[PDB]
Amino acid sequence: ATGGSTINFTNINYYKDSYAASATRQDFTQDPKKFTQPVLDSIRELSAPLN
Amino acid sequence: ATGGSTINFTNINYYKDSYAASATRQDFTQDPKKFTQPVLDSIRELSAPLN
Amino acid sequence: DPVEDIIRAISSATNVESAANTTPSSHRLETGRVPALQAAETGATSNATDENMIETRCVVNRNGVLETTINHFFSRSGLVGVVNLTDGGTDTTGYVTWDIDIMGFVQLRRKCEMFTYMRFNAEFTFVTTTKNGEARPYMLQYMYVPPGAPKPTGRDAFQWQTATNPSVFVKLTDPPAQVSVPFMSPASAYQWFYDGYPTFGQHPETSNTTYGLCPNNMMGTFAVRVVSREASQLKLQTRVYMKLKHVRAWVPRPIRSQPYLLKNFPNYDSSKITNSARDRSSIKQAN
Amino acid sequence: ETGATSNATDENMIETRCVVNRNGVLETTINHFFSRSGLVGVVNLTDGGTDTTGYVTWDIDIMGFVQLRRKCEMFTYMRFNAEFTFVTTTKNGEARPYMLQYMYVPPGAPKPTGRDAFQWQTATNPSVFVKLTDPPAQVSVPFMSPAS
Amino acid sequence: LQYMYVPPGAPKPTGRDAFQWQTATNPSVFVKLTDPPAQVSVPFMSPAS
Amino acid sequence: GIPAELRPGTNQFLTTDDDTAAPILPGFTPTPTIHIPGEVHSLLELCRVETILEVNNTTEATGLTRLLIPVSSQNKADELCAAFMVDPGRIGPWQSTLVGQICRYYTQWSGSLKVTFMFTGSFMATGKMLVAYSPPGSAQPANRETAMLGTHVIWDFGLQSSVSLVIPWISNTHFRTAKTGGNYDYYTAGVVTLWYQTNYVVPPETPGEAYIIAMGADLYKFTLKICKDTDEVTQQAVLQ
Amino acid sequence: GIPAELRPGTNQFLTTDDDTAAPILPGFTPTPTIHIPGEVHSLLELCRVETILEVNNTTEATGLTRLLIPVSSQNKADELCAAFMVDPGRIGPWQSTLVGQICRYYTQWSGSLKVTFMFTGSFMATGKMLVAYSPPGSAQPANRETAMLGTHVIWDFGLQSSVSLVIPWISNTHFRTAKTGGNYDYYTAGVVTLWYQTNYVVPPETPGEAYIIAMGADLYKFTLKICKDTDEVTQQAVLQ
Amino acid sequence: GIPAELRPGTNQFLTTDDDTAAPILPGFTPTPTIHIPGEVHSLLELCR
Amino acid sequence: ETAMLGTHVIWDFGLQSSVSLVIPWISNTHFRTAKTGGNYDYYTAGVV
Amino acid sequence: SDRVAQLTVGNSSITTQEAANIVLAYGEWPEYCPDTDATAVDKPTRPDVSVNRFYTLDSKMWQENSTGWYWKFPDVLNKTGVFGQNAQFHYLYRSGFCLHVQCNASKFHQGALLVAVIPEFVIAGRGSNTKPNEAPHPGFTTTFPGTTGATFHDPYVLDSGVPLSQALIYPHQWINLRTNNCATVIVPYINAVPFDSAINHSNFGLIVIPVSPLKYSSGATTAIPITITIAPLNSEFGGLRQAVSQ
Ligand SMILES: CCCCCCCCCCCCC/C=C/[C@H](O)[C@H](N)CO
Ligand SMILES: CCCCCCCCCCCCC/C=C/[C@H](O)[C@H](N)CO
């Protein structure tokens, strides 16, 4: 945290093109549930999977 | 003191990272009483220490 | 309800922007009030002051206190290492690795060892010259090889592809390279003193080579080469200067009076101990 | 057998305490994982005595060097931009003050036949002029695939 | 080149390679003869006023 | 013009530096995007997937039988079966797991692992096992009276065919560097052993032995830092 | 682009310069901080701690008896005992004090020192002493009639076992450079002498001599400037 | 970074030029001023 | 080293000349019958 | 209301009629690990009164040539009481301590003892060897003395190569035989990590040294011991497993 009044500037671009710029803007998005649990019928952690 | 309208800028950072920056923001905080006088019962300067 | 027995710091902080002032104090003739007498057996220092010992004037004190903070004390670059790259004729490796230990050079070592725990950032500058001194227009590679990463086996070996390892490409005729490094310890602070062993097991009483070596300080290796195919004939040293910034420090400890011997060990001479203060002719002659 | 991974967690297996976890997750994104420069190619320009071509072409394939190849092949499809740096040295190593030309010859464009041949007029092809004593050339490249 | 400032009381270097050039504290300037001349700002250091 | 003073770091090329470079193609608009299934954002999504620990990684394990854990009816009760170290970025049975490859591009890791066992028997095969976890300390437990002292889970063979031993993060540090031992052996995570709780009991006319399959993954707690280059790859000459 | 004109100071590397450098690890988040006891902020906190002046620093003082001040029953009254110069950054008994090491990284100092004496006798040992301070001037006082003229404090041995002689800042300059003499001897601070006020008087059956222990520290007034490199350390070759 | 084009006057050292240079001592606070009699501001006071 | 493990009190000779070791009630039963041992030695209280 | 103190911890208690205040190291009390600083997920164990209490080592006897002793903590307690057992079955230990030192003598005796608390106290090989191969190191029985304590070869440099005179930076107190017969320091948990292994790592050592030597005129008592009593304030244990003594 901290960094009071550090006036950061990075993403400013000197060219008319978008791909000339510098990464990132980051991303915090995740969706593990599509790779880890890609099943039709949802299964709870309490219940046994197969009944 | 003095330095009327000198428009100082230092802490401005050119990178997306906090550790890329330059010291300091300083600090004026002190707590000598923890090293110099670390005793339970507080002792005044007037009174004799041991009574 | 049925079983009842189941059911801070005294010191505080104050900003000090200048040296302390002095208030006027007159004499005192009376009993019961004794600022001079102290008892040091409590481990606390005498709190007696200028103003209760003598008669003083008033001094507004604008002396600055600022330069002595741990930030300003520790932010300076000083030599943490030297790397010798032959690359020349005869036996030729073509590269040199330097394990990163800043305890190898005494002058910056004694400042750090005033403290048990330290958490900081870093600014490394690489000043490379030739054997005597000069700069030719040769391209260089400074690569960081973190723990577990393959160390390069040759001048041209594949570990220099550095698809991941950070590397710096620089010409000897360019101003010295410089980078910022974070706090990489897997613990929460660096520690220059570790009383303990890294692993379990039975420890030899004859020779303990593992005593006192903290795992948390192993930062990987620094490796140099000359970017090229055949070889150069030159021979060069790289000097490595580390600056500490954003630094915090804990638990101050005494400053070392004995000559250092080894990087990683506080070994000193059982013979030959040097006194901390030079000796005079008699205790009754101040000079 | 359902192909789904165990959803069991720390807290239902044993008795746990409370841990506020401020460890950062940020460095492992595909942006930070893949944004590093690593060697995609090496080009040998003789230009010297004896048999002399006077130029060398390199078809652009970044699969030629394993270390950066295995990171890419974790994925079937990729859409990115690029930053190319050209570090040129001499045979052993050095920099002399010679002028260079780095020219991009897109598909269908004439490849240069000689050192001085007319395809170097580059009225259209992008080119970089640089001295061996200059810091290495660098450019940004877009996503040029005719697919998506 | 190395231009080092050795304030009063500080050890003066005894040799070309001597340890006083580690400059963990003393300010120093590293510069090439082919670089534009070095330059620094210095404060008022007198212990009087 | 504007007076400037150049600094160290001039003319250096740092591979990881974030800067703008010049575009080659002014006015270039790329080919439109389309929706593609299965997009990834972070690599921690891929570390939460169970892949197959190779526990039988020993010699004379032939090719694909290296992934199987033989279970048969014992004679002396209270027997050990298989054991592996918990360090996912260390040489061993974790070297074949996806989570083992990704933690090997990084210098450090932290979090809870997970170990899933799937028993492929006949429907008529019953049994119980003890999957125990012992934090760092004395070497591999000698007995199940020693191995029950750690974190363990008893598992009954039955309709549901998998149990999972979660391996909680138990550490002095926040992270553990992944490397070999003798010094870095400070960071060793622990030992997983798998013991017979009772026995592998099977009726007549049924095969006298089966195979457990072990898998491994991470929990929501798992992270990584200080990205580096892996040790598994080696190249000699430019691939033609 | 933007027209620029480069200045002297280009390409120089100044060790103390404050600049930004490039990060090696984009996206790096460090290991979380925790609370650790005993944090320091400035080094003046450490200069306010009393450490032990080595007054017996002379030769034939053996190893650890260098820190002790012998006190016994005198014969001729009005006798001197021990003396040391006040300069904390000067070779002498201050060379073993913490405040003596820190003022030795700086070119100058200002403030009030403090000197604490602790008498380790038997409970039955009584006595009085005179701890005197004389500002710069003629050399070490020859008599206690000369030494009483300066700043002094009389101290009675008793229940409270320590007295403190505060050494007020008395100077023409605001600061004093710490260095040797003959020229810089302009900046010498003064002389501390310790005299018998009456005598060390002891009953029968009790040891006939004791030891005072002296300590030293700073007051809230003390400061430092122009940080440099110390003279105590010497290195020859790279430590292996 | 920011595209720049260097001009004549680069690398010259002009004795009378007004520029910033780097400080040697970060955090340095000088010795307090005091009043001294007889301060001068311009040399025309001395020519009178 | 075995006796420090129990309930203990350290006592310094000085002005106040007495210390008291309180012997808390530590028992399985609510009461203890007072009699000899070998059987009733079940009810033994402890050792000072 | 000062020189008389009583300390009660667990089923144990300590009285002293002659005492100089009490030192609280670095101005903090021992405490349990806060949820924000903690890392390990499993639940620690907190025995309270069975571990936290005064244990009393054997007494070190006090002579004219004595150079002084040291101990390591928790190491002195790893074989004793229920505290020694928990530290063997758990991989993760945290706590503070309350240290108490008893030395008494009579108004005709004299001397002083420096009692300090040194975080991360590293002993040091003694020899002129500058090669890390041929260079000497101390033995395990030296580095970690146990209950029996160890002794200084060079008490002046504290065996670590560091001057004794500056030991007054650590939380300390003196036993000055004319003033006080005990020294008590209350140490918080100090370490760069919240938990650690009690077996592999000792947080801090204790040090008793004769800055001024013992003297008594003939006919008085020659035998003076130095006793040590230490209590583990606020203990936690984690990572339960089988027993490991080392
Ligand atoms: C492009 C090259 C970059 C080089 C980056 C190296 C950064 C390494 C981290 C340095 C942090 C301080 C070093 C660690 C402390 C001491 O050396 C320990 N005693 C090591 O044993
Ligand atoms: C001034 C010189 C500029 C050079 C510009 C070259 C840009 C070429 C586009 C590079 C995009 C990635 C390369 C394509 C992917 C792999 O190589 C394919 N396997 C090629 O077969």
Author numbering:
A (entry chain D), B (entry chain D): 19 to 69
C (entry chain A): 2 to 8, 18 to 297
D (entry chain A): 51 to 198
E (entry chain A): 150 to 198
F (entry chain C), G (entry chain C): 1 to 240
H (entry chain C): 1 to 48
I (entry chain C): 145 to 192
J (entry chain B): 10 to 255
What text does the study give?
Here, we report the atomic model of CVA10 mature virus built from a 3.0-Å resolution cryo-EM map. Except for a few disordered residues in VP4 (residues 1–18) and VP2 (residues 1–9), the mature CVA10 is well ordered. The capsid proteins VP1, VP2, and VP3 adopt the classical eight-stranded anti-parallel β-barrel configuration and follow the expected pseudo T = 3 symmetry, where VP1 surrounds the fivefold axes and VP2 and VP3 alternate about the two- and threefold axes. When compared to the structures of EV71 and CVA16, the external surface of CVA10 exhibits five additional continuous and “star-shaped” dense protrusions surrounding the fivefold axes. These arise as a result of the loops at the fivefold axes, in particular the VP1 BC loop, which assumes a raised configuration. However, compared to EV71 and CVA16, the raised conformation of the VP1 BC loop forming the north wall of the canyon and the refolding of the VP1 GH loop (front part of the south wall) from a short helix to a more extended loop moving away from the “star-protrusion” broaden the front portion of the canyon of CVA10. In contrast, the VP2 EF loop (back part of the south wall) of CVA10 bears a distinct conformation and moves closer towards the “star-protrusion”, narrowing the back portion of the canyon. It is quite likely that these conformational changes of the canyon and neighboring microenvironments, including VP3 BC loop, implicated in receptor and neutralizing monoclonal antibody binding, together with the alteration in electrostatic properties, determine the specificity of CVA10 for KREMEN1 during host cell entry and specify the antigenic sites of CVA10.
Coxsackievirus A10 (CVA10), belonging to the human type-A Enterovirus (HEV-A) subgroup, used to be associated mainly with herpangina, but in recent years has been increasingly reported to co-circulate with other members of the genus such as enterovirus 71 (EV71), CVA16 and CVA6 causing hand, foot, and mouth disease (HFMD) outbreaks in Asia, Europe, and North America2,3. Like most members of the picornavirus family, HEV-As comprise 60 copies of viral proteins VP1, VP2, VP3, and VP4 arranged in pseudo T = 3 symmetry, encasing a positive-sense single-stranded RNA genome. Intriguingly, although CVA10 shares ~69% amino-acid sequence identity with EV71 and CVA16, it utilizes a different receptor, KREMEN1, for entry into host cells, suggesting CVA10 might differ in its mode of entry into host cells or perhaps even in its local structural features that are involved in receptor recognition. Here, we provide models for CVA10 mature virus, empty- and A-particles at atomic resolution, and establish details of the events covering a staged exit of the VP1 N-terminus and ordered structural reorganizations of VP1 GH, VP2 A2B and VP3 GH loops and alterations of viral genome structure as well as genome–capsid interactions during the uncoating.
